[PDB]
Structure formats: structure tokens, C-alpha cells
Amino acid sequence: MPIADYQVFTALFLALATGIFAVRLGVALYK
């Protein structure tokens, strides 16, 4: 039973959130 559209979209949104976390860490490392 393959995953649904909503699962993919929720995963992509959570990846956007962790991308925000990643750029926060990168900015902290640059400073």
C-alpha cells in the first residue's frame, strides 16, 4: 500500500522546517 499525497506533502513541509533549522545552524557557524 503506497503512501498518500498528504504524507508526501507533510514530509516536504517538515523538510522545509529542518531546512530553516539548517540555515540557522549555518548562520550561527558563520558568525
Partner: protein
């Protein structure tokens, strides 16, 4: 001053001199320059006015007894072929918005027709501009809503309101269509201003060099 979340720290350039300043610009689109920021304000005002017109038309059309607003494109039968309609619409709006560009490049603000200020009824003041801006913001959120129930559900805005009133605990944003995506967004957004407060507590507001657009 009220902000985009309770007790928020606004950005340095969002001091409060501009109307409708709740200090909300995490992506910082208009930080380095003021003229471009004035252009963003003008775009916000134009989109908000056209959204007030949109939501008024959709609410009145859905209330009188007509069909859905999105399906009303094929429910219009009259004269004038579609190509002639397109060409007269494009020439009329080209003239109107060229006049609008002249008005904005003169006054710094928009205007209908040759009238750059445009106020025959005389109701120009600092407070009523804020009323217009906030009503336009609300109507923009309302049209985003309206299009979203058109996409997700098969009911009109008043029909969707009646569906919510019938069963608010089982007919809402959190269902099975986009319910989980909305749930994740609510969970993330319920904690992220607390993370902003954490960043302010541990790092502070010392104006970082980088911005979410690469300047």
C-alpha cells in the same frame, strides 16, 4: 504596540513609522531599501483592494442563490465573443493601470483615472488608510480561504460555514484531505514564535549580516 505574535521583537527597520506595522517580515523582503519597500506596500494595497472586491462579489453571488463562484465562468451566456472580450479587457485595464502608474509615480500613492488623489467624498486620513490596509489583508486571507475550500471541498463559502455550524467537531480543516498537512503546520507554528523568543534570549537582536534573500 501589538505585533504578529504576543510580545514579539520587531525588526530594526520595522520601527513603526509605516502603517500596519506589526513587525512581521521573517524573510525580510524589504529591509535594505525603502523605495522597493514602498513598492511592496503599493502591491499589498492593490492586491488587498482587488481582493476586497473579489470577496464582496463572491459573497454576494453565493448569497443570492446563484451557483459556485468558480463554476460561474461557464454560467455566463451573453453577447461579445471571448476574443473581443479579452481585447477590450486588456486595453481598458492597460489604460487604467497606466493611469495608476502615473498616479503612483506622481503622488507616491495610487489613484483611479486622471485623479491622482481621487477622493470626491473626502475621507482621506491616516487612520482610514490603516482601516483599508487591514481590511484588505483580511479580505486577502478570506480569498485564500475561499479558493482553498473550492479546491478541497465542493461547497461554497456560506455552504462551508453552514457545514462547520452543523458539526464543528467533525467538519473543519483537520480531516483526511489536507487535515494532516494543516496539523503539521499548526504544530510547527504553535512552537516557532517560542523559538524566536529563545533565539532572542540566547543570541539577541544584534542584526545579522545575511538575510533570507541573498544580500
Amino acid at each position: 504596540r501589538p505585533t504578529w505574535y504576543p510580545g514579539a521583537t520587531p525588526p530594526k527597520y520595522l520601527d513603526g513609522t509605516m502603517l500596519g506595522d506589526y513587525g512581521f517580515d521573517p524573510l525580510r523582503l524589504g529591509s535594505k531599501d525603502k523605495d522597493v519597500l514602498k513598492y511592496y506596500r503599493e502591491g499589498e494595497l492593490t492586491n488587498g483592494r482587488w481582493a476586497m472586491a473579489a470577496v464582496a462579489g463572491i459573497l454576494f453571488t453565493d448569497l443570492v442563490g446563484l451557483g459556485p463562484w468558480w463554476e460561474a465562468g461557464a454560467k455566463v451566456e451573453s453577447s461579445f465573443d471571448l476574443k473581443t472580450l479579452i481585447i477590450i479587457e486588456v486595453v481598458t485595464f492597460a489604460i487604467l493601470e497606466g493611469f495608476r502608474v502615473k498616479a503612483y509615480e506622481k503622488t507616491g500613492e495610487t489613484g483611479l483615472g486622471p485623479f491622482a488623489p481621487f477622493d470626491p467624498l473626502n475621507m482621506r486620513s491616516d487612520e482610514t488608510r490603516l482601516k483599508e490596509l487591514k481590511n484588505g489583508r483580511l479580505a486577502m486571507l478570506a480569498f485564500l480561504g475561499f479558493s482553498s475550500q473550492a479546491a478541497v471541498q465542493g461547497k461554497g463559502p456560506i455552504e462551508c460555514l453552514q457545514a462547520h455550524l452543523a458539526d464543528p467537531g467533525h467538519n473543519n480543516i483537520f480531516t483526511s484531505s489536507v487535515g494532516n498537512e494543516a496539523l503539521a503546520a499548526v504544530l510547527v507554528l504553535s512552537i516557532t514564535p517560542c523559538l524566536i523568543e529563545a533565539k532572542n534570549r540566547l543570541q539577541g537582536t544584534d542584526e545579522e549580516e545575511f538575510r533570507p534573500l541573498p544580500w
